[PDB]
Amino acid sequence: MEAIIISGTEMAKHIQKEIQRGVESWVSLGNRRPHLSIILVGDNPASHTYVRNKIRAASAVGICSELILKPKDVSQEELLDVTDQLNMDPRVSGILVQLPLPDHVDERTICNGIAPEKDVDGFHIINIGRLCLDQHSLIPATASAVWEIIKRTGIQTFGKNVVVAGRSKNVGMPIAMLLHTDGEHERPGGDATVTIAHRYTPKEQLKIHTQLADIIIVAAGIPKLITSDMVKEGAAVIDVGINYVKLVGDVDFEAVKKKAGFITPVPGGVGPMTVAMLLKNTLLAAKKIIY
Ligand SMILES: Nc1nc(N)c(NC(=O)Nc2ccc(C(=O)N[C@@H](CCC(=O)O)C(=O)O)cc2)c(=O)[nH]1
Ligand SMILES: Nc1ncnc2c1ncn2[C@@H]1O[C@H](COP(=O)(O)OP(=O)(O)O)[C@@H](O)[C@H]1OP(=O)(O)O
């Protein structure tokens, strides 16, 4: 069947309008306009592209931003000095450290250096802890994005088989967490039956599991990891992969769009929604209502 191709770009646009209305409403009440401080380390052109999209989108919804550049050979200590300063600046509502960081910087240490209340990526251990206990939290943007695409398309999760191909602590694990957890908890989940796959799932076992799946979510960085033979007729296929090989996903799109009932393209799928959900988090953080 010809898959319905989900426009992340368009959905992100609708959602940015909602956040824009949200920001004006917050400022209409006597409150400070959200300010997002972004730290970009080094010269990765993809990292530079994503931060520009984030600043441009922030501007569009009336969220102030400032870009703090650091060179690739910056120290862990120097990064934590900046995060400390930003934590103490009451005009900064949100702090984002673009990943990945240089190999000599411990990611987990920097993530934990951001005040939870300002942690718009939700990578701080307290925010991860609260996510894993289904409490109100700043929910990681890409994970939020996937959940939002699913809900606004009307893809049913409740009682459904879902495979998450990816266990990363920033993307994979949060997706598994949102999708499988109780619909009635403080932070509702999808009530889906979730299989977690990763680099040590034999491909033959991954296929056996995807074949039974009502939803495949792949966040692997392996072009054509998901081939049409792996997909159940009518299934939803959410492609979080970004592969510069030409930009392609983890899904064999031209084949899988003939088998699936719903597919996200790359580019134009999860990417723009990552940006949108970060801005939602930036507004939410500014209102200081979780902590
Ligand atoms: N701290 C932190 N680091 C991170 N690395 C991420 N992820 C993180 O920025 N992802 C991301 C991926 C793609 C796009 C994007 O704009 N994608 C478009 C355009 C792609 C392109 O021009 O190359 C698309 O898929 O259509 C934006 C953000 C994050 O959310 N927080
Ligand atoms: N063949 C495969 N099948 C399913 N998932 C795979 C996969 N190969 C990689 N992945 C997963 O896709 C994800 C890639 O995410 P990532 O690049 O952000 O990695 P990291 O967690 O090290 O930062 C990983 O969770 C990865 O599994 P590992 O934790 O074992 O590295």
Author numbering: 49 to 293, 302 to 347
Paste lines from the article:
It was evident during structure refinement that there was only consistent electron density for part of NADP+, and the ribose and nicotinamide moiety at one end of the cofactor were therefore not included in the final structure. The residues that interact with TH7299 are nearly identical in both isozymes, an important exception being Arg278 (MTHFD2) which is a tyrosine (Tyr292) in MTHFD2L. The hydrogen bond formed by Tyr292 of MTHFD2L and TH7299 may allow the inhibitor to be positioned more tightly in the folate binding site relative to MTHFD2, explaining the more potent TH7299 inhibition observed for the MTHFD2L isoform.
MTHFD2L is an isoform of MTHFD2 (72 % amino acid sequence identity), which also catalyzes oxidation of methylene−THF to 10‐formyl−THF. The enzyme is expressed in all adult tissues analyzed to date, as well as in embryonic cells. The MTHFD2L monomer is comprised of two domains, which are connected via two long alpha helices (α1 and α10) and a smaller alpha helix (α5), positioned such that there is a large cleft between the domains.
